[PDB]
Design a protein around this ligand. Structure first.
Ligand SMILES: NC[C@@H]1O[C@H](O[C@H]2[C@@H](O)[C@H](O[C@@H]3[C@@H](O)[C@H](N)C[C@H](N)[C@H]3O[C@H]3O[C@H](CO)[C@@H](O)[C@H](O)[C@H]3N)O[C@@H]2CO)[C@H](N)[C@@H](O)[C@@H]1O
Ligand SMILES: [Mg+2]
Ligand SMILES: [Mg+2]
Ligand SMILES: [Mg+2]
Ligand SMILES: [Mg+2]
Ligand SMILES: [Mg+2]
Ligand SMILES: [Mg+2]
Ligand SMILES: [Mg+2]
Ligand SMILES: [Mg+2]
Ligand SMILES: [Mg+2]
Ligand SMILES: [Mg+2]
Ligand SMILES: [Mg+2]
Ligand SMILES: [Mg+2]
Ligand SMILES: [Mg+2]
Ligand SMILES: [Mg+2]
Ligand SMILES: [Mg+2]
Ligand SMILES: [Mg+2]
Ligand SMILES: [Mg+2]
Ligand SMILES: [Mg+2]
Ligand SMILES: [Mg+2]
Ligand SMILES: [Mg+2]
Ligand SMILES: [Mg+2]
Ligand SMILES: [Mg+2]
Ligand SMILES: [Mg+2]
Ligand SMILES: [Mg+2]
Ligand SMILES: [Mg+2]
Ligand SMILES: [Mg+2]
Ligand SMILES: [Mg+2]
Ligand SMILES: [Mg+2]
Ligand SMILES: [Mg+2]
Ligand SMILES: [Mg+2]
Ligand SMILES: [Mg+2]
Ligand SMILES: [Mg+2]
Ligand SMILES: [Mg+2]
Ligand SMILES: [Mg+2]
Ligand SMILES: [Mg+2]
Ligand SMILES: [Mg+2]
Ligand SMILES: [Mg+2]
Ligand SMILES: [Mg+2]
Ligand SMILES: [Mg+2]
Ligand SMILES: [Mg+2]
Ligand SMILES: [Mg+2]
Ligand SMILES: [Mg+2]
Ligand SMILES: [Mg+2]
Ligand SMILES: [Mg+2]
Ligand SMILES: [Mg+2]
Ligand SMILES: [Mg+2]
Ligand SMILES: [Mg+2]
Ligand SMILES: [Mg+2]
Ligand SMILES: [Mg+2]
Ligand SMILES: [Mg+2]
Ligand SMILES: [Mg+2]
Ligand SMILES: [Mg+2]
Ligand SMILES: [Mg+2]
Ligand SMILES: [Mg+2]
Ligand SMILES: [Mg+2]
Ligand SMILES: [Mg+2]
Ligand SMILES: [Mg+2]
Ligand SMILES: [Mg+2]
Ligand SMILES: [Mg+2]
Ligand SMILES: [Mg+2]
Ligand SMILES: [Mg+2]
Ligand SMILES: [Mg+2]
Ligand SMILES: [Mg+2]
Ligand SMILES: [Mg+2]
Ligand SMILES: [Mg+2]
Ligand SMILES: [Mg+2]
Ligand SMILES: [Mg+2]
Ligand SMILES: [Mg+2]
Ligand SMILES: [Mg+2]
Ligand SMILES: [Mg+2]
Ligand SMILES: [Mg+2]
Ligand SMILES: [Mg+2]
Ligand SMILES: [Mg+2]
Ligand SMILES: [Mg+2]
Ligand SMILES: [Mg+2]
Ligand SMILES: [Mg+2]
Ligand SMILES: [Mg+2]
Ligand SMILES: [Mg+2]
Ligand SMILES: [Mg+2]
Ligand SMILES: [Mg+2]
Ligand SMILES: [Mg+2]
Ligand SMILES: [Mg+2]
Ligand SMILES: [Mg+2]
Ligand SMILES: [Mg+2]
Ligand SMILES: [Mg+2]
Ligand SMILES: [Mg+2]
Ligand SMILES: [Mg+2]
Ligand SMILES: [Mg+2]
Ligand SMILES: [Mg+2]
Ligand SMILES: [Mg+2]
Ligand SMILES: [Mg+2]
Ligand SMILES: [Mg+2]
Ligand SMILES: [Mg+2]
Ligand SMILES: [Mg+2]
Ligand SMILES: [Mg+2]
Ligand SMILES: [Mg+2]
Ligand SMILES: [Mg+2]
Ligand SMILES: [Mg+2]
Ligand SMILES: [Mg+2]
Ligand SMILES: [Mg+2]
Ligand SMILES: [Mg+2]
Ligand SMILES: [Mg+2]
Ligand SMILES: [Mg+2]
Ligand SMILES: [Mg+2]
Ligand SMILES: [Mg+2]
Ligand SMILES: [Mg+2]
Ligand SMILES: [Mg+2]
Ligand SMILES: [Mg+2]
Ligand SMILES: [Mg+2]
Ligand SMILES: [Mg+2]
Ligand SMILES: [Mg+2]
Ligand SMILES: [Mg+2]
Ligand SMILES: [Mg+2]
Ligand SMILES: [Mg+2]
Ligand SMILES: [Mg+2]
Ligand SMILES: [Mg+2]
Ligand SMILES: [Mg+2]
Ligand SMILES: [Mg+2]
Ligand SMILES: [Mg+2]
Ligand SMILES: [Mg+2]
Ligand SMILES: [Mg+2]
Ligand SMILES: [Mg+2]
Ligand SMILES: [Mg+2]
Lengths: 272, 49
RNA sequence: GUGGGAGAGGGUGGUGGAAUUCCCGGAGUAGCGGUGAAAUGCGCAGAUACCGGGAGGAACGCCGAUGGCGAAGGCAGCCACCUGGUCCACCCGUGACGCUGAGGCGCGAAAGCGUGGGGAGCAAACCGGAUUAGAUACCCGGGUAGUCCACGCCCUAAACG
RNA sequence: CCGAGGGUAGGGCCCGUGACUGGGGCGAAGUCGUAACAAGGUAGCUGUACCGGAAGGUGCGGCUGGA
RNA sequence: CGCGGGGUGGAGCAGCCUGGUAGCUCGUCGGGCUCAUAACCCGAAGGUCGUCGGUUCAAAUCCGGCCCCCGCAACCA
RNA sequence: GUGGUUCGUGGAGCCAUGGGGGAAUCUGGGCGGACCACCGCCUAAGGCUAAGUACUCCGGGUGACCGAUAGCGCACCAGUA
RNA sequence: CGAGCUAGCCCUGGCCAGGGUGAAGCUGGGGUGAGACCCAGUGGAGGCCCGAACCGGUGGGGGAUGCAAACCCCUCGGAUG
RNA sequence: CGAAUGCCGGCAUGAGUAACGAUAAAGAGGGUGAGAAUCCCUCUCGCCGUAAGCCCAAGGGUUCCUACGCAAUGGUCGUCAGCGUAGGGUUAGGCGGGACCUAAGGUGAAGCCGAAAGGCGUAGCCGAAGGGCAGCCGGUUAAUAUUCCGGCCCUUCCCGCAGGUGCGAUGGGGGGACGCUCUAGGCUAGGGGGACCGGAGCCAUGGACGAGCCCGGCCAGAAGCGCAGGGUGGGAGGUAGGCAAAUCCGCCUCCCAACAAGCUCUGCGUGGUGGGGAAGCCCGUACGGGUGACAACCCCCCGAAGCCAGGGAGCCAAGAAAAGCCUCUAAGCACAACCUGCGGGAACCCGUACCGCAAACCGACACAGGUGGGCGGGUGCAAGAGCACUCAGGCGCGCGGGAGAACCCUCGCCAAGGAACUCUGCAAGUUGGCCCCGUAACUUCGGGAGAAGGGGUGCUCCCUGGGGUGAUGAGCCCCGGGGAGCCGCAGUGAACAGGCUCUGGCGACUGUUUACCAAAAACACAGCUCUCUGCGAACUCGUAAGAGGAGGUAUAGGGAGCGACGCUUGCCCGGUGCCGGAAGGUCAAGGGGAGGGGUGCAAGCCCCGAACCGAAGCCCCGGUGAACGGCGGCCGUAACUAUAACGGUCCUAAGGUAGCGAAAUUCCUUGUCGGGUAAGUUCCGACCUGCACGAAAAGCGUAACGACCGGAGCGCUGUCUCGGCGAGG
RNA sequence: UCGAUGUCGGCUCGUCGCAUCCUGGGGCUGAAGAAGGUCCCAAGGGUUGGGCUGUUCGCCCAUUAAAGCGGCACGCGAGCU
């Protein structure tokens, strides 16, 4: 989708909005299973650690279910599909037959009315979740766990997905939304299908405000400020850095790798 | 234009208050000295009810 | 109408083997590539040649034809779903309901453009090596768009019988 | 009231002119190369795209007006 | 005016700083191939080294004086 | 690897130690300025211990100390206005 | 010792007169094999417009032991973000 | 002590000078007094009036009221006062806050961390104009009142009887409970009208004894009705979720509802009853009292931003929590308890005066400044909180009087010319609101547009078309149309209310910034690109624990640059950086000890110490330019000259492509041509010899947008020729 | 003169020098006349308005009897810009 606009105001011409057709006549969220008071704040205890944040629409947290072995075997019916301000993926709310309700990040396909479930059993269909081993090599899938019982963590962004590649001992090779081939443990669930609402990468914010709404204040270039507060700074009419591009704190930012070398997680990785 | 003193009872006891100064090691010393110097008033005289 | 037949006609979903390039392991040495001839290039940091494993993209050998199909552009491994034209037989129905067609409308190779994806091989530009008086070329070694998919544009041709 | 015309204001079409610039035509014997016609010494022509003093080269698909 | 760089056969460049020995590409001349010209092949010629001085036995080469040439600075007022 | 002593790596001991290695109970151990022999001196890895010493919020005495711009910032209801 | 000024953010309340312009979306009609599309009517979008409050502080004039250690007069910027 | 712009105190000078704090404005009569421009009174005049009037909050803390008073305080005076002395004054179960709740954030048992101090910290607690909660209208004081008094109406606790039921928790669930913009229906506050009801009174100066003028025609009010409107399904079985248990909730499955029909629940009318009640006139105030009064206390109209509220529609940026309240069950307990109706009893702490857009607060001042919320009437101008006048109400701003010079400030007008002024039309003028005609290049189809340029606007009479509220009518109130006619120089007759255009530069744009000399071409901005980051992420803060990132997960997050959009972004990897290289060379501690030394009679003890084994880093081998950066010099050549497509040669890592170019880059420079001018060191268009452009420190363009900067024209003018007169301070 | 002598140009106001641009007097002239050239006396008075530049100065446009050169802190900011 992606709503468009006629130019009746510069900016609201290039501006592009999402299409909330996929939003089952829902909107008002569900008390109980979410929301919780969401403590918004751009800095830690005192100081500001991440810069340029703050401001932007008030938000309510939708406490989603990111570990599904909670209900192994208990099937549930997908009730609605709603908007979640805390993420890029739309989310689906679903009523188990157990009578319990919980939200799930909604996969592309999954339609309201559908029945979905989790566990070793589970049929390989959009929405169902199973330990990685039991999933057919090659099938795509989202909401992966990295270590058994620790909760989902990979491919949860709007319309992202990972593809299974092979098996190898108690591990199974994956291919993350980034292109890295990772070795994940067999016992990590991963609900099947891709995340959906993949038009998300196409929304043209539009104006200055639009960014402000999502809570992101203006970002000033180092080049603009002085030597006192950033490498690229001073002296006359602009300047060409004058040294290898660096961050406010001073480490190179055009090429310098960061992953800490001797990490134990190294051996389970294979790509880029 | 607007100036720098905008009186506020709450802020004043809340900041230069007595329990305020007792709470920290530096403030307790603030008291010591003032006590040791004589000062009729150890801390500002906030008021009302 | 009825009853049948051929076919790379079109779209969608899935799928198979060959081969190339790359990665990994084994094994293995003093050269491999390439050309009219050479060099550039690659190779004792373990190449080429051989075996085993994996990744990935694109095109379908033999059948294959001087063949078929489509209105044209064009269409080729295999499977299924949707769908267009067409031919024969039976001479049952309608009953002149026909032909062409300014404009319109739709389709339209390749290259090209927009957005996102993909990227093995190839390959404008581009960089080297040779060739020549000079080579912005023909030859060689590299290589980016593009070539691939989805959507939307572009409307060209020795779009030729 | 209308009203020739005069005034003011903004359009439309057409003609003349302009430093400078784009390509074109024409002009016996100036310069640079060899693109085409013979297999033209890289078969050629073509649509498009890029590049090059110049003819032109190359990529992609096409064409017999070549084999 | 000041700083440093440079004048070499016809053209463009080496040659010095560690003084004795001028080298390369083109061009020019003679000869070949071609019907002829170019290409290509075979041979040959050409340099008071910007000038006036001395430095040493000996100066393109070291050192000062001028003749042009090129580049850099001419700031605070 | 450092600190302490006069000792700033010095021929650098002795005394404390953060890190690594890691003993013995008198024929046992440390020390006398690297180290070794001799000759000597002490007896580590538990603790307590007056007096002699410092100070002057406070009381008292004395002044070749000041005398209200001096002397405490304040002789006076001053850490006040 | 200070964020009772100023800067940013966090929690929670408030304020923005009155006029303009008229997006989508619907509704009917037209169009077609189904469309795209085109009409009106409706609708009320927007870091949209005029303009107070309010938030500013453009240009000039005054003031310059000032009313004022930043002020006053005329003018001017934005004003549902 | 004579000096130190010395330190402290005192007193001179300028000097009876400058000032006396908004140009809103004063005059008079009568008081009191030792003394009046300045205090009290009356009359006239002026000023504010979306306040310069009322009502809260903050802050202030006696400033409030009254008697007695002027030394000082008051910019003068002062009998007055916000000043001096004294006395009086603030009354709450229902208003605000607390014996209630939570937010950010504080604190913090458990726990973690840190040399000490101290840092972190789920429970809990603190924490508020947010949630919760029961008083409305009049009367009284010199000063207080939703507080005292009167009328009416409520809330809790505690203890009873009456009677219903399984009651029952800090525990389960429900609810509380939510954004922005635009809105419907019915109401109220508020306001206009009245031939109608009620009133003291008034006929002025030429007319009027008249449906004449002037004044006023309400407030609160329990249940019930009535009118609006919000909430809400009711059954029965099954149950594996809601961390114990539930009959509750949730989720299945059948039934009747789909309606607000019915339950409740607010609002608003009416309501037993209670209260108020003008002008004028009489009085004595520093003010209030009395009469008008048995006051009347009615009918239409307009009408909210407020009320019904959890109303509805739409949109994306997706919009607190906890308690009260309902329900559910657990331990316990069912002679308890709890629910409902009637009683009586109990109902505490603090705040209450006064100032409050200002002389009582922040600015050292009775300071032309700064200060949050509610009410803010009428008439007219299209509207409105705008503007002019003006109710209520409050002011004339705490030195006056004369004078009528220069000059200054603020304002008004001007012959003829009109930008000649000047760095610059700086300034000031022209223009101006509504309605109707009518509008170009260009363009991103929106715009450009209020383009440009025009005509209308008052009053009178006639005819006439819609609504709205009333019944389908009169009235009242809104919007229209046609036709005649009247007066001025002039009809948004006053006040508020764009000058216009053409053309370049820069930045896309609305925004932002040097509080107190710079608002811009600078910052930001959507968007593009590069690079990091697999999640105990990267990055940042922190010694740490820990937190932010993020309760996010590559369509995500950090960093860098560029900066809408269009067309594009060429070559150089030699140096620097970064990325990739289980080979080499070096490379520290450590391992190793060939070998040598010092002492001992010696075993031994203690030193040096070569091979060799040794990381990261550098070196080396490759890559990488939307990484740091860089992107040539000299000669010759065409059949008039001329120039050079063409050639030679030198060096480089490679030798600036496109596009632009005397530029925001051009030194020589007022380059040289062309354009505007009578004249043009600027400006616009060209050429290219680019001192010293050039492609993401982007290149060249670009509609729209601008308190940006340059050039021109039209209009208009005191800017000027060139001044003159008048006004007030 | 740095315990401060405000500094280019313009504007307002001037004032002085003569090495005179104009007007008056005069000699030589290759001075027929008219008009010039050059020089001597002479400073009493006069010495225009615009276009461009911050400009001084200059170049132009239209004139004029002429469109004079210089000084006074490159006259004059407790006079202005
Ligand atoms: N008519 C020829 C048109 O112009 C071009 O041709 C033009 C040129 O290429 C051509 O130039 C030629 C040159 O090619 C050739 N190699 C040398 C010759 N001297 C030149 O000649 C030219 O100049 C000379 C003297 O001035 C004249 O007398 C003669 O007419 C003229 N053609 O002269 C032509 C104009 O006259 C295109 N090549 C041709 O295809 C096109 O159709
Ligand atoms: Mg909640
Ligand atoms: Mg911190
Ligand atoms: Mg803290
Ligand atoms: Mg995109
Ligand atoms: Mg930025
Ligand atoms: Mg800066
Ligand atoms: Mg720095
Ligand atoms: Mg820099
Ligand atoms: Mg610069
Ligand atoms: Mg530089
Ligand atoms: Mg028949
Ligand atoms: Mg036909
Ligand atoms: Mg096509
Ligand atoms: Mg194609
Ligand atoms: Mg290739
Ligand atoms: Mg050749
Ligand atoms: Mg090749
Ligand atoms: Mg053909
Ligand atoms: Mg023309
Ligand atoms: Mg021409
Ligand atoms: Mg050819
Ligand atoms: Mg040829
Ligand atoms: Mg050929
Ligand atoms: Mg071609
Ligand atoms: Mg090529
Ligand atoms: Mg200086
Ligand atoms: Mg030491
Ligand atoms: Mg020892
Ligand atoms: Mg000893
Ligand atoms: Mg001893
Ligand atoms: Mg002791
Ligand atoms: Mg004293
Ligand atoms: Mg004395
Ligand atoms: Mg003293
Ligand atoms: Mg519409
Ligand atoms: Mg609107
Ligand atoms: Mg706006
Ligand atoms: Mg506005
Ligand atoms: Mg002396
Ligand atoms: Mg003194
Ligand atoms: Mg005087
Ligand atoms: Mg005087
Ligand atoms: Mg005076
Ligand atoms: Mg006054
Ligand atoms: Mg008035
Ligand atoms: Mg008092
Ligand atoms: Mg009083
Ligand atoms: Mg009195
Ligand atoms: Mg006085
Ligand atoms: Mg005063
Ligand atoms: Mg008296
Ligand atoms: Mg008093
Ligand atoms: Mg109590
Ligand atoms: Mg909290
Ligand atoms: Mg703490
Ligand atoms: Mg609490
Ligand atoms: Mg409260
Ligand atoms: Mg209360
Ligand atoms: Mg009172
Ligand atoms: Mg409960
Ligand atoms: Mg609850
Ligand atoms: Mg009369
Ligand atoms: Mg009532
Ligand atoms: Mg249970
Ligand atoms: Mg009365
Ligand atoms: Mg609602
Ligand atoms: Mg609680
Ligand atoms: Mg119960
Ligand atoms: Mg009170
Ligand atoms: Mg009061
Ligand atoms: Mg107020
Ligand atoms: Mg006053
Ligand atoms: Mg004031
Ligand atoms: Mg205010
Ligand atoms: Mg009102
Ligand atoms: Mg109006
Ligand atoms: Mg007003
Ligand atoms: Mg005039
Ligand atoms: Mg006139
Ligand atoms: Mg005129
Ligand atoms: Mg002028
Ligand atoms: Mg002038
Ligand atoms: Mg100008
Ligand atoms: Mg102006
Ligand atoms: Mg302009
Ligand atoms: Mg412009
Ligand atoms: Mg801008
Ligand atoms: Mg500001
Ligand atoms: Mg400033
Ligand atoms: Mg501005
Ligand atoms: Mg400013
Ligand atoms: Mg964390
Ligand atoms: Mg978080
Ligand atoms: Mg990023
Ligand atoms: Mg930038
Ligand atoms: Mg920029
Ligand atoms: Mg580049
Ligand atoms: Mg490199
Ligand atoms: Mg490089
Ligand atoms: Mg390299
Ligand atoms: Mg490396
Ligand atoms: Mg190494
Ligand atoms: Mg130029
Ligand atoms: Mg000209
Ligand atoms: Mg010119
Ligand atoms: Mg330049
Ligand atoms: Mg530049
Ligand atoms: Mg760049
Ligand atoms: Mg730019
Ligand atoms: Mg702006
Ligand atoms: Mg002009
Ligand atoms: Mg004047
Ligand atoms: Mg006057
Ligand atoms: Mg000086
Ligand atoms: Mg002096
Ligand atoms: Mg003389
Ligand atoms: Mg003469
Ligand atoms: Mg003079
Ligand atoms: Mg001078
Ligand atoms: Mg000068
Ligand atoms: Mg001067
Ligand atoms: Mg001055
Ligand atoms: Mg002076």
């Amino acid at each position: 989708a992606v709503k468009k606009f006629k130019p009746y105001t510069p900016s609201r011409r290039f501006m592009t909005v999402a299409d909330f057709s996929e939003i089952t006549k829902t909107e008002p969220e569900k008390s109980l299973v979410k929301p919780l008071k969401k403590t918004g704040g751009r800095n830690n205890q005192g100081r500001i650690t991440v810069r340029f944040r703050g401001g932007g629409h008030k938000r309510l947290y939708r406490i989603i279910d990111f570990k599904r072995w909670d209900k192994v075997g208990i099937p549930a019916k997908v009730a609605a599909i709603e908007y979640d301000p805390n993420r890029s993926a739309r989310i689906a709310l679903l009523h188990y037959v157990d009578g319990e309700k919980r939200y799930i990040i909604a996969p592309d396909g999954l339609q309201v009315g559908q029945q979905v479930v989790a566990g070793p059993d589970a049929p390989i269909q959009v929405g169902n979740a199973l330990p990685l081993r039991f999933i057919p090599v090659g099938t795509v899938v989202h909401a992966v766990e990295l270590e058994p019982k620790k909760g989902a963590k990979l491919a949860r962004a709007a319309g992202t997905s990972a593809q299974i590649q092979g098996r190898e001992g108690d591990y199974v090779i994956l291919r993350l939304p980034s292109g890295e081939l990772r070795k994940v443990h067999g016992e990590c669930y991963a609900t099947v299908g891709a995340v959906g609402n993949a038009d998300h990468k196409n929304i043209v914010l539009g104006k200055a405000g639009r960014s402000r709404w999502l809570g992101r204040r203006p970002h000033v270039r180092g080049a603009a400020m002085n030597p006192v507060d950033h490498p690229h700074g001073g002296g006359e009419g602009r300047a060409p850095r004058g040294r290898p591009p660096a961050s406010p704190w001073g480490w190179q930012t055009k090429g310098l790798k960061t992953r800490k070398r001797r990490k134990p997680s190294s051996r389970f990785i294979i790509a880029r | 234009m607007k100036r720098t003193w905008q009186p506020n009872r709450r802020k004043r006891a809340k900041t230069h208050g007595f329990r305020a100064r007792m709470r920290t090691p530096g403030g307790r010393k603030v008291l010591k000295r003032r006590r040791q110097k004589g000062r009729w008033r150890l801390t500002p005289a906030v008021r009302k009810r």
